[PDB]
């Protein structure tokens, strides 16, 4: 929730998830995702609900979206015979999700 | 014709996306959220990493920067300069004459205005 | 030779519109550096004095905008009014730039446009346009030293982008050998006046024109249009050949410049002669280069050398590891160990990063640098 | 009569003094006042006194005597004072034949902190010096030094009202908190080291004023004080570009010393204890008659011996030579740039004028040197 373009009353907006609640969340290049987001992702995947405490407003939206993700094996197509978790960047805890 | 994409540093790679994508122009300053499609040819450029690094070094990563947007590029002509002082001489002459204000008979096999006109023609055809 | 190269800058080049475009004008951009108090200021003073359209500016007293398009509120009519910044004004004549090395990075972004284009395109704000400003560039700089110090890469020792560097037409480098034996003489000159306190007999006895100069300059400007014909061509080439044996622009320079020389002496065609000194003058910064570079350092033995040994070792410790990973530590260890060309563990870290990121290497951990697999 | 006038002018004006009706806040006026005005019709911009000088002269040692006689109020630092003397004296400038001029004047830096009451000196000079002006950084605004074009009354209109430099020009200008003056100030000053030069292109000002002032700079070292572990120019915040301009940088640093501190302590006890500090025996010079003798000396315009010229040269080579032989840091500042030379030239040129000279004897030179070596190198203690 942030100040709108210049002057209007300050509008609380969702990430794609709450938007896609019960819909579907389509994203790619998580390797390209800032941890700032990454926490959000883990949070939803875990709780399936998005809590928001700022500024004054404190809530939890419920995003029911299913996760669909395209990603880039770190560098080379097949990074390694090494397990994919090795063969790719993203964190296994998230991955197990 | 975007010179020195290098000076993009890290901000334009963001741009390449829509650019390479729909050339949609996504704008929300929140004044509005508006995607402006575009279609524009890419006449593009950058320097190699260390000067002309490309010789032993692999182009990819000898070019470096464009990350995936790299993958968005259909063609590439690598330019390196080795003197055939034959050739060196050649261009040398070429230049010189050019530098000589006159007389340059540098004239295109086809007339240029004629060209642009023709260009109009070629667009018309749809192979 | 300074005073000379300048003099040419006064006579500089000749404008050529081609059929259309063309328009190399006569422009020549000279830069000069050295130990400070060189009078390096004083000159800019003199030229600025002479130059009808010239303007003198300080580094950092500046940014890319003040040179153009203030677009201020007129406020006389309570209007907004487009105000030519410094450069548009300076179109014609020359520009006097203090503290070039010190200019804001935002600033001088301007320059590349100017220098190359010789014009300026402002799409900004209410009106989008490309305005032409054609003017000569005289820039002053202080090596970091501020004495650039012996050896070093000079090209380093000057700081600046080696490209933007390369852009400047005339690269003048000033230095002091402590001719004893000079200081004496200089001190005689200097020590004069003295007498007279009321300004009199500055350089006497020596022959010099005064205002006749100004006029002469004017006329020569107006009435002269030199053309080099064929003569120059051959030697001219052989020169720049020896040079690259360096850049084309060097040639280009040589062209415009010599054109000033024969412009002086009122030659409508060039002697193949007078190109000699024309080269020589370039050979001066080179003769000032005695006592591009970036790449040179950066090739093995510099960076190619660097990464080469790097990979080499990586391969080695792999082999000796039964192919297991090389450690960050052992890496750093053998790499400073074979000692010689001094691979600093930071530099090590950097090049390593390069190969890995180049997928010329594949490795990881905090204090754990495993090995690579270069697939590329 | 229009256009004849310029700011920072000392002029005798002749005009009939005429009122024009005005008052303050309406609730503020009994009536009628006049608020008045002035009108301008016309503008005008060594006999037995040599005796008064001769009192000083005949005593001799006028350089040291007077040296002492400057601000005797403070204990110590006869060297700096001696400098201040020449600072007050100046000379001889020059013009080049075309001609270009060369100042012509002294530029003094006073380093060190906190104490010295270093300012106290500045107060002194600005007091004694006619056309001296005491200022501080935040302090005197840039527009304090610069002139605004602002209408003036009675006559008309859009008046360039100058300050500081323009105000005190042909006479010294005193700067305090010199570190705190920020930047725009720093620029201008950097420029006015061209002497005779201030230029305002802003808006309704195309004019370039001539400032003849002399400059005295009091600043505190980078906090807190002169880290000896900090190199020179490390402990010193300022750019050499300006430092290059500064002719005399007196760096005043304090290492406590039992013995002398006794001495100074006594001075300070005697006065206040006495209003009069100097006793047994020093005759300090009345800044009045002092100023007189100064006037008389200022007339001299000495000329240099070729020999002094030569020694000067040799020494100068020695100077640049050792200065660079120093090479990297500590120590320093190098390089003894020509301006070092030129400066010393003006310096001896002044010392001579204390002799009233025209001779410019080599001793005056060697003195200027001793002074020079003296200014810095205090870093070694």
DSSP annotation string for B31-48: S-B----------B----
| Residue of D52, D48, D44, D58 lying closest to D13 (CA atoms) | D44
Closest approach of A97 to chain C, Cα-based (Å): 24
Q: Which residues pair with D106 in a beta bridge?
A: none
Task: Tell me if chain B has a CB within 8 Å of the CB of C269.
Answer: no
Find the radius of gyration of the CA atoms of chain C.
Answer: 27
Q: Find where tokens 């390069």 sit.
A: C354
Give yes or no for a contact between D326 and D374, defined as CB atoms under 8 angstroms apart: no
Calculate the CA D102 to chain-centre distance: 17
Residues D214, D192: Cα–Cα separation, whole Å: 10
Minimum Cα–Cα distance from C187: chain D residue: D313
In the numeric block, which tokens belong to residue C373?
Answer: 């697999």
Place of tokens 């004028």: D353
Q: How was this structure determined?
A: cryo-EM
C304/B contact by beta carbon, under 8 A: yes
Task: Report the DSSP pairing between strands D107-111 and D248-251.
Answer: parallel
Residues of D in contact with C202 (CB under 8 A): 96-99
C-alpha dihedral, B11 to B16 to B17 to B23, nearest 10°: 130
Please report all neighbours of B, defined by 3+ CB atom pairs within 8 A.
A, C
Give me the residues paired with residue D191 across strands: none
**Helix, strand or coil, per DSSP, at residue C134:** coil
Per DSSP, which regions of chain A are E strands?
24-28, 50-52, 59-61, 66-70
Q: For chain D, which residues lie within 8 Å of any Cβ of chain C, measuring from their own Cβ? A: 92-102, 187, 240-241, 244, 301, 303-304, 309, 312-313, 316-317, 320-321, 324, 335, 337-339, 341-342, 345
Provide CB contacts within 8 A for C323, sequence distance 6+: none
Stretch 235-254 of chain C: residues touching chain D, C-beta under 8 Å? none
Backbone angles phi, psi at D241, to 5 degrees: -50, -50
Min Cα distance B105 → chain A (Å) is 51
| Residue D14 DSSP label | E
Domain count, chain D: 1
Nearest partner of D103 among D113, D112, D90, D116, judged by Cα: D90
C373 touches chain A (CB under 8 A): yes
Residues 54-73 of B with CB under 8 A from A: 68
Q: Is A76 on the interface with C (CB under 8 A)?
A: yes
List all residues 6 or more positions away from D57 whose beta carbon is below 8 Å from its beta carbon: D293
D360: left (phi over 0), alpha (psi -120 to 50) or beta: left
* Interface contact C202-D97, CB threshold 8 A: yes
* D22 labelled ligand-binding: no
For C22, list phi and psi in degrees, rounded to 5: 60, -120
CA distance D57 to C277: 63
Please tell me the number of Cα atoms within 13 Å of C2 on its side-chain side: 19
3-state class (DSSP) for residue D329: coil
**Token code pair at residue C211:** 């205002």
Is C359–A75 a contact, with Cβ atoms under 8 angstroms apart?
Answer: yes
D117 in a labelled binding site = yes
Provide the 10 A C-beta neighbour count for residue B46: 16
Q: Does residue D55 lie in a domain region?
A: yes
Distance of CA A74 to the CA centre of its chain: 19
Within 8 A of B30 by CB-CB distance, chain A residues are 4-5
Nearest Cα of chain C lies from the Cα of A89 at a distance, in angstroms, of: 11
- Tokens for D291, please give them: 């100023």
For residue D297, give its domain range.
46-375
Query: Residue B32: its chain A contacts at CB < 8 A?
Result: 5
| Angle (nearest 5°) at CA D128 between D127 and D134 | 40
Task: Report the chain C residue with the minimal C-alpha distance to residue A80.
Answer: C373
Q: Report yes or no on D320 lying in a domain.
A: yes
Element (H, E) at C30: strand C29-34
Distance (Å) from the C-alpha of residue B28 to the closest C-alpha of chain A?
Answer: 9
Euclidean distance between CA atoms D50 and D56, whole angstroms: 10
Structural domain contains residue D241: yes
CA distance B53 to B2: 22
D354 inside domain: yes
Cβ-Cβ contacts under 8 Å, A72 against chain B: 68
**Cβ-Cβ contacts under 8 Å, C373 against chain A:** 80
Residue D186 belongs to domain with CATH number: 3.40.50.300
Annotated binding residues of C: 34-41
Residue D121: inside a domain: yes
Tokens found for residue D218 = 């009091």
Tokens coding C53: 């359209």
CB contact under 8 Å between D95 and C191, yes or no, is no
- The tokens of A62 are what? 């419920």
Q: Which long-range contacts (CB under 8 A, 24 or more apart) does C241-250 make?
A: C241/B83, C241/B85, C241/B88, C241/B89, C241/B92, C243/C282, C244/B83, C244/B88, C245/B83, C246/C292, C247/C166, C247/C292, C248/B95, C249/C166, C249/C167, C250/C282
CB atoms within 10 A of CB C226: 22
Q: Which own/partner contact pairs does C158-161 have at CB distance under 8 Å and 24+ positions apart?
A: C158/C33, C158/C101, C159/C101, C160/C101
Residue D16 lies in a domain: no
How far apart are alpha carbons D4 and D40 in whole angstroms? Answer: 12
Classified as helix, coil or strand, D161 is strand
Domain membership flag for residue D258: yes
Q: Nearest CA of chain A to the CA of B117: how many Å?
A: 44
Tracing tokens 């003769």 back to the chain, one arrives at C287
Residue D101: helix, strand or coil by DSSP?
strand
Contact residues, chain A, for C362 at CB < 8 Å: 75, 79-80
Which residues are CB-neighbours of C258 under 8 A, at least 6 positions away? Answer: C228, C232, C270, C274, C275, C278
Nominal resolution (angstroms):
7.1
Is D173 within a domain? Answer: yes
Sole residue written with tokens 């697939």? C375
Q: Which residues of A touch C372 (CB under 8 A)?
A: none
Residue D316: list chain C partners with CB under 8 A. 183, 187
Measured between CA atoms, the residue of chain B closest to residue C25 is B101
Contact D101, D195 (CB under 8 A): yes
Q: What is the C-alpha R_g of chain A?
A: 16
Instruction: Please tell me whether D324 is known to bind a ligand.
Output: no
Q: Among residues D283, D302, D353, D357, which one has the least CA distance to residue D55?
A: D283
DSSP designation for C325 = P
CA distance D5 to D43: 9
| HSE value, Cβ hemisphere, 13 Å, CA-based, for C61 | 18
């Amino acid at each position: 929730v942030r100040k709108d373009p210049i002057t209007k009353e300050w509008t609380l907006e969702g990430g794609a998830l709450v938007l896609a609640d019960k819909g579907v969340c389509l994203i790619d290049e998580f390797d390209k995702m800032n941890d700032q987001d990454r926490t959000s992702i883990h949070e939803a995947m875990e709780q399936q609900s998005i809590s928001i405490s700022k500024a004054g407003i404190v809530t939890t939206l419920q995003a029911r979206c299913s996760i669909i993700a395209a990603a880039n094996p770190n560098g080379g197509r097949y990074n390694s015979t090494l397990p994919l978790a090795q063969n790719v960047s993203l964190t296994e805890p998230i991955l197990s999700r | 014709c975007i010179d020195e994409f290098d000076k993009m540093d890290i901000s334009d790679q963001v741009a390449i996306h829509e650019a390479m994508e729909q050339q949609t122009i996504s704008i929300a300053k929140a004044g509005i959220h508006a995607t402006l499609n575009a279609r524009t040819s890419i006449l593009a450029a950058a320097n190699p990493v260390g000067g002309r690094y490309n010789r032993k070094l692999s182009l990819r990563g000898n070019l470096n920067m464009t990350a995936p947007i790299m993958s968005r590029f259909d063609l590439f002509f690598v330019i390196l300069d080795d003197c055939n002082e034959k050739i060196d001489t050649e261009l040398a002459s070429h230049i010189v004459d050019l530098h000589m204000k006159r007389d340059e008979a540098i004239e295109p096999p086809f007339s240029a205005e004629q060209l642009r006109r023709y260009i109009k023609y070629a667009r018309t055809f749809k192979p | 030779d300074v005073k000379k190269g300048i003099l040419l800058q006064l006579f500089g080049g000749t404008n050529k519109t081609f059929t259309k475009g063309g328009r190399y004008r006569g422009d020549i951009n000279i830069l000069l550096c050295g130990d400070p108090s060189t009078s390096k200021s004083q000159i800019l003073q003199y030229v600025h004095k002479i130059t009808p359209r010239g303007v003198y500016t300080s580094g950092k007293g500046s940014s890319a905008v003040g040179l153009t398009a203030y677009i201020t509120r007129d406020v006389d009519t309570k209007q907004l009014v487009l105000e030519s910044g410094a450069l548009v004004l300076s179109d014609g004549g020359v520009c006097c730039i203090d503290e070039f090395d010190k200019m804001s990075d935002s600033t001088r972004s301007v320059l590349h446009e100017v220098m190359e284009q010789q014009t300026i395109s402002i799409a900004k704000a209410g009106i989008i346009t490309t305005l032409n400003a054609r003017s000569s560039i005289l820039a002053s700089a202080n090596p970091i030293g501020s004495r650039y110090n012996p050896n070093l890469p000079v090209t380093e020792n000057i700081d600046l982008p080696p490209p933007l560097l390369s852009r400047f037409d005339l690269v003048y480098l000033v230095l002091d050998k402590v001719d004893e034996k000079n200081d004496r003489e200089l001190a005689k000159h200097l020590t004069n006046l003295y007498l007279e306190d009321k300004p009199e007999h500055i350089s006497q006895d020596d022959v010099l024109p005064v205002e006749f100069l100004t006029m002469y300059i004017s006329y020569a400007k107006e009435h002269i249009h030199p053309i080099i014909t064929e003569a120059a061509k051959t030697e001219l080439v052989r020169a720049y050949v020896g040079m690259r044996k360096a850049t084309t622009r060097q040639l280009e320079s040589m062209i415009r410049l010599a054109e000033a020389h024969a412009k002086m002496k009122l030659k409508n065609v060039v002697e193949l002669e007078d190109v000699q000194e024309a080269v020589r003058l370039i050979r001066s910064a080179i003769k000032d280069y005695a006592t591009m570079n970036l790449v040179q350092t950066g090739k093995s033995v510099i960076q190619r050398k660097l990464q080469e040994d790097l990979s080499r070792e990586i391969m080695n410790v792999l082999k000796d590891q039964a192919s297991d990973s090389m450690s960050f530590n052992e890496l750093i260890k053998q790499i400073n160990e074979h000692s010689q060309d001094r691979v600093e563990s930071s530099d090590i870290q950097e090049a390593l990063s390069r190969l890995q990121q180049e997928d010329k290497v594949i490795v990881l951990g905090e204090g754990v640098r495993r090995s690579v697999r270069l697939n590329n | 009569l229009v256009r004849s006038l310029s700011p920072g002018d000392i002029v005798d004006v002749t005009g009939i003094f005429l009122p024009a009706p005005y008052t303050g806040f309406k609730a503020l006026k009994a009536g009628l006042l006049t608020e008045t005005y002035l009108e301008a019709q016309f503008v005008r911009q060594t006999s037995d006194v040599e005796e008064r000088v001769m009192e000083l002269i005949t005593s001799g040692d006028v350089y040291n005597r007077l040296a002492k006689s400057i601000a005797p109020e403070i204990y110590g630092n006869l060297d700096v004072k001696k400098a201040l003397l020449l600072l007050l004296v100046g000379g001889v400038d020059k013009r080049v034949g075309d001609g270009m001029k060369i100042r012509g004047d002294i530029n003094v830096c006073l380093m060190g902190d906190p104490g010295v009451a270093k300012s106290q000196l500045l107060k002194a000079i600005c007091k004694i010096s006619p056309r001296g002006v005491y200022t501080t950084g935040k302090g005197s605004s840039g527009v304090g030094l610069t002139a605004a074009v602002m209408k003036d009354p009675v006559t008309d209109e859009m008046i360039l009202e100058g300050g500081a430099l323009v105000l005190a020009d042909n006479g010294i200008c005193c700067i305090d908190e010199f570190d705190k003056m920020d930047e725009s100030d720093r620029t201008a000053i950097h420029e006015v080291m061209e002497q005779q030069t201030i230029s305002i292109s802003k808006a309704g000002i195309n004019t370039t004023l001539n400032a003849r002032t002399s400059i005295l700079a009091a600043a505190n070292p980078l906090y807190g004080r002169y880290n000896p572990r900090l190199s020179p120019l490390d402990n010193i915040n300022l750019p050499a570009a300006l430092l290059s301009r500064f002719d005399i940088l007196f760096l005043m640093l304090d290492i406590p010393s039992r013995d002398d501190d006794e001495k100074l302590a006594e001075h300070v006890t005697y006065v206040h204890m006495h209003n009069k500090q100097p006793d047994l025996d020093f005759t300090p010079v009345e800044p009045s008659k002092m100023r007189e003798y100064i006037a008389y000396a200022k007339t001299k315009r000495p000329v240099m011996s070729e020999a002094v010229n030569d020694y000067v040269v040799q020494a100068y080579i020695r100077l640049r030579q050792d200065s660079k032989r120093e090479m990297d840091s500590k120590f320093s500042f190098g390089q003894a740039t020509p301006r070092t030379l030129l400066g010393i030239i003006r310096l001896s040129q002044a010392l001579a004028k204390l002799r009233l000279a025209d001779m410019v004897d080599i001793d005056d030179v060697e003195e200027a040197l001793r002074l020079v070596r003296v200014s810095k190198e205090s870093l070694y203690q």
